[PDB]
UniProtKB/Swiss-Prot annotation:
Chief location category: cytoplasm
Keywords: Acetylation, Cytoplasm, Lipid-binding, Nucleus, Phosphoprotein, Transport
Function: Lipid transport protein in adipocytes. Binds both long chain fatty acids and retinoic acid. Delivers long-chain fatty acids and retinoic acid to their cognate receptors in the nucleus.
Protein's cellular compartments: Cytoplasm; Nucleus
CDD domains recorded: FABP4
GO MF term (any one): long-chain fatty acid binding
Record carries keyword ATP-binding: no
A cellular component term, taken from the record's GO annotations: lipid droplet
Subunit note: Monomer. Homodimer. Interacts with PPARG.
Protein name (Swiss-Prot/TrEMBL): Fatty acid-binding protein, adipocyte
Length: 131
């Protein structure tokens, strides 16, 4: 996938604190992550997609191949098993840990990058626009 290629800036966010709460993020990290306004910078070299999120709070980065499970340390220090695929133009990213799982979908919508984060019954939506 490449229509995702570019530098993206968070412009709106709903339910992110609830989402983080359900995932199990401690209060102190929620407070600083919630206020954060990260850049998500996505690139692709052949079959390796790289995604970087930068903020004063924390920078993270993952590089992966569609369909191949990899170990991820998250911004909230969970050690998860991640598997990201491309489904009908949507990048679906799944993280598995302690028998729990959360799904993060990234999709292009007009000129936005829309991110839907789901944990159990909570759904958070985050909108990023080209910088
Ligand atoms: O950037 C995001 O929008 C984002 C999207 C999906 C899940 C998460 C999680 C987090 N964030 C925010 C994030 C990710 C990576 C780096 C920086 C941040 C920041 F700054 F908190 F927004 C997410 C924080 C840890 C809980 C899981």
């Amino acid at each position: 996938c490449d229509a995702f290629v570019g530098t993206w800036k968070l412009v709106s966010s709903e339910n992110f604190d609830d989402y983080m709460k359900e995932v199990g993020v401690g209060f102190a990290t929620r407070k600083v992550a919630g206020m954060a306004k990260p850049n998500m910078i996505i690139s692709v070299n052949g079959d390796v997609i790289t995604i970087k999120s930068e903020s004063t709070f924390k920078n993270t980065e993952i590089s992966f191949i569609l369909g191949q499970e990899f170990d991820e340390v998250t911004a909230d220090d969970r050690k998860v098993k991640s598997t990201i695929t491309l489904d009908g133009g949507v990048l679906v990213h799944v993280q598995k840990w302690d028998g729990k799982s959360t799904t993060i979908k990234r999709k292009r919508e007009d000129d936005k990058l829309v991110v839907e984060c789901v944990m159990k019954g909570v759904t958070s939506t985050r909108v990023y626009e080209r910088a």
